[PDB]
């Protein structure tokens, strides 16, 4: 496949690393009785280690010839799950939290203190403030067509130079 | 008689796109003016109905038409049909592409810069007028024909939308599963 | 020695003279502000660079200002 | 001098012997200075695909390699050209 | 000019305030002043001072 | 009598569009009554020149027998 | 307890609180659906 990758679950080295993996761990198991904290910790241990092998092996994940599991960032869609799906998650919550902070500066700016609530919260108006960005996308795109997301020329200091 | 009966006798720009390059002073001419945008309206929508009335008419069996000039390749699908005109007919096609060519590069060569409203020109007008119309007919006919040429183009572009959609995601279009 | 100069924004309000630790300014008559006064730099070769003045200044930007000169014993600061 | 304003360059950009040319004249040249770099490199590229042609660089031929450098020679004469009708010329 | 109350632009480039409004306080009658006019301004400087004084062709009018 | 005037290259270059301003008019007079601008673009195309030849050095060795004295690549 | 409220509500006291919640949120998720490598689950 791609960079002459294969899939994890066809790939051997992936599959030596799950039994060395959980040799270790039944190894240290021996040196204790069955019913014990200790063995009832490295038993769940082991269960959550044989897990997260499955997982992958039907991930549809690429492995290399060291058996780890690679990620693919071309913009295939067919590794979406890897880079493009938790990439616009990551998206959707950072541009909620600048635009709902930015709300707020703009909103307490209009006021004889406006530094005095930016170090003692106004929480019943802060709270309000925050769950208004989950449609930012929207919001954000009628101030950009309105005039009010940047401002003019004239209105930023500018050093000397220019 | 108007473009907007459809719409609700009202410009139809949500997202706004008309008004960006005048809502702010941060880009200075990144934008098209209108007057390029009323210009690659018109133009998507000439090259939309002459693409589509093309599969349509050499679409072969089904509703299709089948029809076929004699001499030239036969070809089942138009996805592949210009690589093969193109590897088999090197004179044709490039007697046709250098027509494209010379015409496309005239429309603008004469006028100024349409991307800034600098043109001097109205937005569609090529100089193919030969047939003398516009010059017999009266200003309401004529004012009405370019609004049966923008329609025609609008409903071409979606159809040629629709056409590219149907081979990209084959559950896109249900009303062309059935067509055939 | 240093260069200290003065310039037309001066308001007169003699706090770069109360915080010269070598005696280089002082106040003279001036009949362009308020206060009638601005200051003058007549014993720059005092001048050891400290710049308290130009923290003492309230304009903006500084009306007094000290520019880096040739050192001498005096602006070097030497006791020896 | 050099230095020009307005949507369109003055006409002794081009140079002293372009400057008196027509627009016309220019375009026609270009059109075909376009032509004689396509050809040129077309036959190259059969040369280059014949058997017993390609031995020991035997492909390369001078005429080819002179079409080959007037590709850029029809650049240049096209904008000409456009500046030529600019300037009512 | 401005009047007492008005609010104005800095023009003048080494200030801290160029491109930014604030709001005209006194105005020196007395034309030997080359500084007449008392602006201040809401925000300080990097020495912590909230006020200048300008001359009329250094200040803008906003409304 | 044959060849191009540097100056009068530089005056003309301002694209119609007018979004690089004025253009490159007045550059022709910064370079020559300057010599730090010269110098900082001489030492600029050097420093580029001296890295792309630590690259094609290594990956297409030119000189017989090197990349086999390990330590002098 | 108005003064009480206006010192919770203080900077300090509220992104403590803030994060608290929130590692604590990223903890029970990695608690309940472990090892999320990718979407693959
Ligand atoms: C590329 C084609 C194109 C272009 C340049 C224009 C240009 C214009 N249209 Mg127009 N229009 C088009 C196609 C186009 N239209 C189609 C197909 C329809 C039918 C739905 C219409 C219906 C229509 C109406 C009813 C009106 C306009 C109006 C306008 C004007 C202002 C709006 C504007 O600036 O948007 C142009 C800006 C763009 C950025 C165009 C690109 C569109 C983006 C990229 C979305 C495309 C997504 C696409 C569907 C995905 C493909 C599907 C599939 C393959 C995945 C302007 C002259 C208004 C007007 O005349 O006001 C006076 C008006 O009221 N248009
Ligand atoms: C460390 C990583 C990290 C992560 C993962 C997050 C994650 C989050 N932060 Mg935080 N944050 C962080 C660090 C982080 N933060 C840091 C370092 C700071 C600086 C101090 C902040 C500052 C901060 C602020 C100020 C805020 C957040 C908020 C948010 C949340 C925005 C998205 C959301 O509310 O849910 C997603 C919600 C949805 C997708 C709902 C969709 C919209 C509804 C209407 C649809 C309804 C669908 C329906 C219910 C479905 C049921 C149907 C049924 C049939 C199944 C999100 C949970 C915001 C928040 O908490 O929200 C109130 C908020 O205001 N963050
Ligand atoms: C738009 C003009 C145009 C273009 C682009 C071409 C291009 C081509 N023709 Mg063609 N042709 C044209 C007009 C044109 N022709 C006309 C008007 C006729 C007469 C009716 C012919 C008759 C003709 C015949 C009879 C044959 C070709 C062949 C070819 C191919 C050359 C061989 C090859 O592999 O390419 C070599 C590579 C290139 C040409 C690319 C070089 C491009 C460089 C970067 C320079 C740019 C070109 C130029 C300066 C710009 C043109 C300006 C123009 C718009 C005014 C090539 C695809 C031959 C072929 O192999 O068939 C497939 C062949 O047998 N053509
Ligand atoms: C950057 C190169 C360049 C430049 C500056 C010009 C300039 C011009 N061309 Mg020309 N042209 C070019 C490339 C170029 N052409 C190419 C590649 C072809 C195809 C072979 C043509 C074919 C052509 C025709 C057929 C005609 C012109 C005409 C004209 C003139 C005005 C009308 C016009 O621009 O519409 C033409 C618009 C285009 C060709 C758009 C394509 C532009 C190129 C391909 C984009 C690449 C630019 C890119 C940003 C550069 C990046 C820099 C670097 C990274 C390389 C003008 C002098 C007309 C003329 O003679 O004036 C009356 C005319 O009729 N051109
Ligand atoms: C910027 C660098 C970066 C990135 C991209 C990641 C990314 C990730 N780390 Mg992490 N990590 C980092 C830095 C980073 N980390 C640092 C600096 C350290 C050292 C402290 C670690 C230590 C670390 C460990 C030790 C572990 C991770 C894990 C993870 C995975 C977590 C998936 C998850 O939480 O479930 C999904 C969670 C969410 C989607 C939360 C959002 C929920 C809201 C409600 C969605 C809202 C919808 C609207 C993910 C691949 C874990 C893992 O499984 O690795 C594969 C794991 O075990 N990380
Ligand atoms: C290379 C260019 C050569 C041009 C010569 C000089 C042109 C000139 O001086 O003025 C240029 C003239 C046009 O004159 C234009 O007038 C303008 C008016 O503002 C300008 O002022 C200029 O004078 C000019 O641009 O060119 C022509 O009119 C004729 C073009 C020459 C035709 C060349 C193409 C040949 C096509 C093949 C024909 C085959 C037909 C035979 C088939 C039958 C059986 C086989
Ligand atoms: C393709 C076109 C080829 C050019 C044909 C020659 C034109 C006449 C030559 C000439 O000097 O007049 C034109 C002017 C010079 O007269 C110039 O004339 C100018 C005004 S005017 O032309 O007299 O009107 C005047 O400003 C200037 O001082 C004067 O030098 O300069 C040119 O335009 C010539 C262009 C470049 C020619 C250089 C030849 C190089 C030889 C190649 C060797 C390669 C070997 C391998
Ligand atoms: C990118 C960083 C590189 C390092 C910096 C070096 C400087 C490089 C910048 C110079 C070029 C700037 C070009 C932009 C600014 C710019 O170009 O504006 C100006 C430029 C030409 O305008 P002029 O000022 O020359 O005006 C000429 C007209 O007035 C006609 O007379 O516009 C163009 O059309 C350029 C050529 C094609 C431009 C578009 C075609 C290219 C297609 C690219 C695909 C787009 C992606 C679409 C995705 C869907
Ligand atoms: C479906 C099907 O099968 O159909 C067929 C046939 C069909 C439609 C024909 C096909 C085609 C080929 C096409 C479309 C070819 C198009 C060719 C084209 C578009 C050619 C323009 C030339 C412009 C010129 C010379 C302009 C001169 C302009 C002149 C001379 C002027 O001076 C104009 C002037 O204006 C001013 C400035 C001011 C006015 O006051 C005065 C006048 C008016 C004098 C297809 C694609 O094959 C399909
Ligand atoms: C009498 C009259 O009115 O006539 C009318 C006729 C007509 C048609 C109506 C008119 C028109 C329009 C015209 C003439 C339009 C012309 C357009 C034209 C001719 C546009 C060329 C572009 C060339 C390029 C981009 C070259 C690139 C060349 C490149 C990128 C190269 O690097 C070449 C090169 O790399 C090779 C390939 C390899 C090497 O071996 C050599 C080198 C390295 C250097 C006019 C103007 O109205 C006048
Ligand atoms: C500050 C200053 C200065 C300086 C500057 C500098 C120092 C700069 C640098 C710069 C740089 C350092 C740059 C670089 C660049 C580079 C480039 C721009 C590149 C290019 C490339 C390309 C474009 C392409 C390539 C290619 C080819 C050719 C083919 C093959 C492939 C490829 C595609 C890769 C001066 C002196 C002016 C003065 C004033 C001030
Ligand atoms: S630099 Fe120091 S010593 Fe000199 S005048 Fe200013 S405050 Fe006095
Ligand atoms: S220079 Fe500064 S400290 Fe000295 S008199 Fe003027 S305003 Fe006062």
Same mark, same amino acid.
């Given at each position: 496949?791609?960079?002459?990758?294969?899939?994890?679950?066809?790939?051997?080295?992936?599959?030596?690393?799950?039994?060395?993996?959980?040799?270790?761990?039944?190894?240290?198991?021996?040196?204790?009785?069955?019913?014990?904290?200790?063995?009832?910790?490295?038993?769940?241990?082991?269960?959550?280690?044989?897990?997260?092998?499955?997982?992958?092996?039907?991930?549809?994940?690429?492995?290399?010839?060291?058996?780890?599991?690679?990620?693919?960032?071309?913009?295939?869609?067919?590794?979406?799950?890897?880079?493009?799906?938790?990439?616009?998650?990551?998206?959707?919550?950072?541009?909620?939290?600048?635009?709902?902070?930015?709300?707020?500066?703009?909103?307490?700016?209009?006021?004889?203190?406006?530094?005095?609530?930016?170090?003692?919260?106004?929480?019943?108006?802060?709270?309000?403030?925050?769950?208004?960005?989950?449609?930012?996308?929207?919001?954000?795109?009628?101030?950009?067509?309105?005039?009010?997301?940047?401002?003019?020329?004239?209105?930023?200091?500018?050093?000397?130079?220019? | 008689?108007? @473009?907007?009966?459809? =719409?609700?006798?009202?410009?139809?720009?949500?997202?706004?796109?008309?008004?960006?390059?005048?809502?702010?002073?941060?880009?200075?001419?990144?934008?098209?003016?209108?007057?390029?945008?009323?210009?690659?309206?018109?133009?998507?929508?000439?090259?939309?109905?002459?693409?589509?009335?093309?599969?349509?008419?050499?679409?072969?069996?089904?509703? @299709?038409?089948?029809?076929?000039?004699?001499?030239?390749?036969?070809?089942?699908?138009?996805?592949?049909?210009?690589?093969?005109?193109?590897?088999?007919?090197?004179?044709? %096609? @490039?007697?046709?592409?250098?027509?494209?060519?010379?015409?496309?590069?005239?429309? =603008?060569?004469?006028?100024?810069?349409?991307?800034?409203?600098?043109?001097?020109?109205?937005?569609?007008?090529?100089? %193919?007028?030969?047939?003398?119309?516009?010059?017999?007919?009266?200003?309401?006919?004529?004012?009405?024909?370019?609004?049966?040429?923008?329609?025609?183009?609008?409903?071409?572009?979606?159809?040629?939308?629709?056409?590219?959609?149907?081979?990209?995601?084959? @559950?896109? =279009?249900?009303?062309?599963? =059935? %067509?055939? | 020695?240093?260069?200290? &100069?003065?310039?037309?924004? !001066?308001?007169?309000?003699?706090?770069?003279?109360?915080?010269?630790?070598?005696?280089?300014?002082?106040?003279?008559?001036?009949?362009? !502000? &308020?206060?009638?006064?601005?200051?003058?730099?007549?014993?720059?070769?005092? !001048?050891?660079?400290?710049?308290?003045?130009?923290?003492?200044?309230?304009?903006?930007?500084?009306?007094?200002?000290?520019?880096?000169?040739?050192?001498?014993?005096?602006?070097?600061?030497?006791?020896? | 001098?050099?230095?020009?304003?307005?949507?369109?360059?003055?006409?002794?950009?081009?140079?002293?012997?372009?400057?008196?040319?027509?627009?016309?004249?220019?375009?026609?040249?270009?059109? /075909?200075? /376009? /032509?004689?770099?396509?050809?040129?490199?077309?036959?190259?590229?059969?040369?280059?695909?014949?058997?017993?042609?390609?031995?020991?660089?035997?492909?390369?031929?001078?005429?080819?390699?002179?079409?080959?450098?007037?590709?850029?020679?029809?650049?240049?004469?096209?904008? /000409?050209?456009?500046?030529?009708?600019?300037?009512?010329? | 000019?401005? *009047?007492?109350?008005? *609010?104005?632009?800095?023009?003048?480039?080494?200030?801290?305030?160029?491109?930014?409004?604030?709001?005209?306080?006194?105005?020196?009658?007395?034309?030997?002043?080359?500084?007449?006019?008392?602006?201040?301004?809401?925000?300080?400087?990097?020495?912590?001072?909230?006020?200048?004084?300008?001359?009329?062709?250094?200040?803008?009018?906003?409304? | 009598?044959?060849?191009?005037?540097?100056?009068?290259?530089?005056?003309?270059?301002?694209?119609? #569009?007018?979004?690089? #301003?004025?253009?490159?008019? #007045?550059?022709?007079?910064?370079?020559?009554?300057?010599?730090?601008? $010269?110098?900082?673009?001489?030492?600029?195309?050097?420093?580029?020149?001296?890295?792309?030849?630590? $690259?094609?050095?290594?990956?297409?060795?030119?000189?017989?027998?090197?990349?086999?004295?390990?330590?002098?690549? | 307890?108005?003064?009480?409220?206006?010192?919770?509500?203080?900077?300090?006291?509220?992104?403590?609180?803030?994060?608290?919640?929130?590692?604590?949120?990223?903890?029970?998720?990695?608690?309940?659906?472990?090892?999320?490598?990718?979407?693959?689950?």
């Amino acid at each position: 496949d791609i960079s002459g990758l294969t899939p994890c679950k066809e790939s051997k080295q992936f599959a030596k690393r799950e039994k060395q993996a959980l040799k270790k761990l039944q190894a240290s198991l021996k040196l204790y009785a069955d019913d014990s904290a200790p063995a009832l910790a490295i038993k769940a241990t082991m269960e959550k280690t044989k897990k997260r092998f499955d997982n992958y092996g039907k991930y549809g994940l690429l492995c290399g010839s060291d058996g780890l599991p690679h990620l693919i960032v071309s913009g295939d869609q067919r590794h979406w799950g890897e880079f493009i799906t938790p990439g616009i998650l990551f998206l959707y919550i950072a541009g909620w939290i600048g635009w709902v902070g930015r709300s707020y500066l703009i909103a307490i700016r209009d006021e004889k203190k406006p530094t005095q609530k930016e170090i003692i919260i106004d929480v019943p108006l802060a709270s309000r403030l925050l769950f208004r960005g989950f449609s930012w996308p929207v919001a954000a795109y009628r101030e950009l067509l309105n005039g009010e997301l940047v401002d003019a020329a004239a209105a930023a200091a500018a050093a000397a130079a220019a | 008689a108007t @473009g907007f009966e459809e =719409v609700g006798g009202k410009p139809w720009d949500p997202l706004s796109l008309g008004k960006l390059e005048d809502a702010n002073d941060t880009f200075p001419n990144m934008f098209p003016k209108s007057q390029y945008l009323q210009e690659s309206e018109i133009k998507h929508g000439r090259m939309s109905m002459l693409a589509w009335t093309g599969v349509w008419a050499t679409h072969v069996g089904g509703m @299709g038409l089948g029809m076929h000039i004699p001499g030239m390749p036969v070809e089942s699908d138009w996805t592949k049909a210009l690589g093969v005109f193109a590897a088999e007919q090197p004179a044709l %096609f @490039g007697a046709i592409l250098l027509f494209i060519s010379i015409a496309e590069g005239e429309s =603008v060569g004469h006028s100024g810069d349409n991307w800034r409203n600098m043109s001097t020109k109205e937005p569609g007008n090529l100089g %193919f007028d030969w047939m003398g119309l516009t010059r017999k007919l009266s200003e309401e006919q004529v004012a009405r024909y370019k609004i049966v040429e923008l329609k025609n183009g609008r409903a071409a572009m979606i159809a040629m939308a629709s056409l590219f959609a149907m081979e990209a995601i084959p @559950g896109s =279009v249900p009303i062309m599963n =059935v %067509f055939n | 020695s240093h260069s200290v &100069k003065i310039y037309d924004t !001066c308001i007169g309000c003699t706090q770069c003279v109360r915080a010269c630790p070598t005696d280089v300014l002082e106040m003279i008559p001036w009949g362009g !502000c &308020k206060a009638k006064q601005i200051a003058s730099a007549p014993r720059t070769e005092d !001048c050891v660079g400290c710049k308290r003045c130009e923290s003492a200044c309230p304009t903006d930007f500084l009306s007094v200002r000290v520019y880096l000169w040739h050192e001498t014993t005096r602006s070097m600061g030497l006791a020896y | 001098d050099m230095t020009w304003e307005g949507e369109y360059p003055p006409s002794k950009v081009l140079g002293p012997i372009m400057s008196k040319m027509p627009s016309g004249l220019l375009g026609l040249i270009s059109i /075909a200075c /376009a /032509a004689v770099c396509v050809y040129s490199i077309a036959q190259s590229g059969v040369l280059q695909q014949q058997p017993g042609a390609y031995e020991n660089g035997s492909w390369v031929k001078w005429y080819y390699v002179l079409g080959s450098f007037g590709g850029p020679l029809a650049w240049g004469t096209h904008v /000409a050209s456009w500046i030529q009708r600019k300037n009512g010329m | 000019g401005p *009047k007492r109350g008005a *609010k104005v632009k800095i023009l003048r480039k080494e200030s801290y305030w160029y491109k930014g409004t604030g709001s005209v306080v006194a105005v020196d009658q007395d034309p030997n002043t080359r500084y007449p006019v008392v602006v201040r301004f809401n925000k300080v400087n990097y020495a912590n001072v909230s006020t200048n004084n300008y001359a009329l062709d250094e200040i803008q009018e906003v409304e | 009598g044959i060849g191009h005037n540097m100056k009068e290259i530089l005056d003309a270059h301002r694209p119609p #569009g007018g979004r690089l #301003g004025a253009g490159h008019v #007045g550059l022709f007079e910064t370079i020559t009554n300057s010599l730090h601008m $010269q110098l900082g673009l001489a030492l600029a195309a050097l420093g580029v020149a001296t890295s792309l030849t630590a $690259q094609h050095m290594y990956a297409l060795t030119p000189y017989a027998y090197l990349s086999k004295d390990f330590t002098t690549e | 307890m108005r003064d009480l409220k206006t010192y919770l509500s203080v900077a300090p006291v509220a992104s403590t609180l803030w994060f608290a919640a929130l590692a604590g949120l990223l903890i029970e998720i990695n608690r309940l659906f472990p090892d999320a490598l990718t979407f693959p689950f």
